[PDB]
């Protein structure tokens, strides 16, 4: 889906852990499945980092 991490450096770390061939399959699947939680009511946002 669309996905929003909370820093350019955590985007770089996120990319580099997704690209390599030695991290876990659950992890590498999850890096392209984690999703921010932005609520227009209650004035809260949740972002992965």
């Amino acid at each position: 889906d669309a996905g929003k991490v909370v820093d350019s450096e955590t985007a770089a770390i996120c990319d580099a852990i997704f690209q390599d061939e030695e991290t876990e399959g659950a992890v590498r699947r999850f890096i392209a499945e984690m999703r921010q939680r932005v609520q227009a009511d209650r004035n809260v946002v949740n972002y992965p980092s």
Binding site: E24, G25, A26, R29
Partner: protein, 397 residues
């Protein structure tokens, strides 16, 4: 305990779901859990056994992950999966036999073996999977102190107690009066007898009563209540109370007049049944009070009138019985019944490896002595060992 059930649930599913030729989307969510299990369990060493004749085995886990790249699972993947599964099944078998064999008076609900104390860390918490069996559900609900219920088919709530009571007796033993009973398994067979057949009782009616206290509170019990207890209806010779002499019992059977079956909880009458047989229900109770009475028949044919004289020699003794059989019941504590085999698995493990008698459980795992004095520490030990027996009964057939 949760991670032990999780190991066994994944090994059961991976024997079931990972087969030859099956589609990958059927097993795509199981292989990720099994790989998480392999990743968690690598680098760790365990030691099982060391009590009785249970041998000490050392466990070392160094396995590669399973492939996630097939469309239909071929036989290579099935054979390497069967190797890893057989090693983990042997591991969890020996952990379960190491846990069912141990006990503690202090806090029995805690893990006692070294392997399950090592598995109770948060490093192993990512092994965890669904907790869908009844025993692990009631384990997780009682770990948060909520209400549980184990559904039993014919529960062994009654200890074996075959005895009697003489309300009227003498050393001649020719004019007796009182009750006899058999409490066994889920069945109460009671029979009050009078030798005079109430020939001098007021209004020719003799009142009998039999009160059975339970050890744990049963809930929503279907109970077959029949008259005419079959075991106490044929002639027999019976030793006395002190065991000195024997006395003869030649019964003829009247029907039970004015049956009142009451189901007491804390002395309060929850359910009552007045002269109703067949299947009855008792919603919440821990005491069963049977109140039946023997009434002398006011009209008798000449074949009956020769049985009951007004004088002393009674060769035919009036006897009135009831039978009460709990078919199924929901109990908050663990028990044994005719459906599960968990007590049989616990006793088989404790008798196979020649295990010494510990501080909690009775010698030889006597269920009569275990339900006679069913203390809460013994309850906690019994629930823990039955949960581990359910886990091993999932893996080991």
């Amino acid at each position: 305990m949760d991670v032990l059930y999780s190991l066994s649930k994944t090994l059961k599913d991976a024997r079931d779901k990972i087969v030859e030729g099956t589609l990958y989307s059927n097993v795509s969510d199981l292989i990720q859990q099994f790989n998480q299990m392999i990743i968690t369990m690598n680098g760790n060493e365990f030691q099982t056994g060391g009590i009785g004749n249970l041998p000490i085995r050392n466990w070392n886990f160094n396995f590669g992950l399973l492939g996630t790249t097939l469309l239909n699972l071929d036989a290579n993947y099935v054979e390497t999966a069967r190797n890893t599964i057989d090693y983990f099944v042997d591991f969890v078998d020996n952990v379960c036999m190491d846990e069912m064999v141990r006990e503690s008076q202090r806090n029995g609900i805690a893990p006692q073996s070294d392997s399950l104390r090592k598995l109770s860390a948060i490093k192993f918490k990512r092994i965890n999977f669904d907790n869908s069996s009844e025993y692990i559900e009631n384990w997780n609900l009682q770990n948060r102190r909520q209400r549980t219920g184990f559904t039993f088919h014919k529960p062994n709530i009654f200890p074996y107690s075959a005895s009697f009571t003489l309300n009227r007796s003498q050393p001649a033993h020719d004019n007796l009066m009182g009750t006899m009973w058999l409490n066994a398994g889920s069945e109460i067979q009671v029979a009050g007898f009078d030798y005079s057949c109430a020939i001098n009782a007021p209004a020719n009616i003799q009142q009998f009563e039999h009160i059975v206290p339970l050890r744990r509170v049963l809930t929503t019990a279907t109970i077959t209540l029949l008259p005419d207890a079959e075991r106490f209806s044929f002639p027999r010779v019976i030793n006395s109370a002190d065991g000195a002499t024997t006395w003869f019992f030649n019964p003829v059977i009247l029907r039970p007049n004015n049956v009142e079956v009451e189901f007491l909880l804390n002395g309060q009458i929850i359910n009552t049944y007045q002269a109703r047989f067949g299947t009855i229900v008792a919603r919440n109770f821990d005491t069963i009070r049977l109140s039946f009475q023997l009434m002398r028949p006011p009209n008798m044919t000449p074949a009956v009138a020769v049985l009951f004289p007004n004088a002393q020699p009674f060769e035919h003794h009036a006897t009135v019985g009831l039978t009460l059989r709990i078919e199924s019941a929901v109990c908050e504590s663990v028990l044994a019944d005719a459906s599960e085999t968990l007590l049989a698995n616990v006793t088989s493990v404790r008798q196979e490896y020649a295990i010494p008698v510990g501080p909690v459980f009775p010698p030889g795992m006597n269920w009569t002595d275990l339900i006679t004095n069913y203390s809460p520490s013994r309850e906690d030990n019994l629930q823990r060992v039955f949960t581990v027996a359910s886990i091993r009964s999932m893996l080991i057939k």
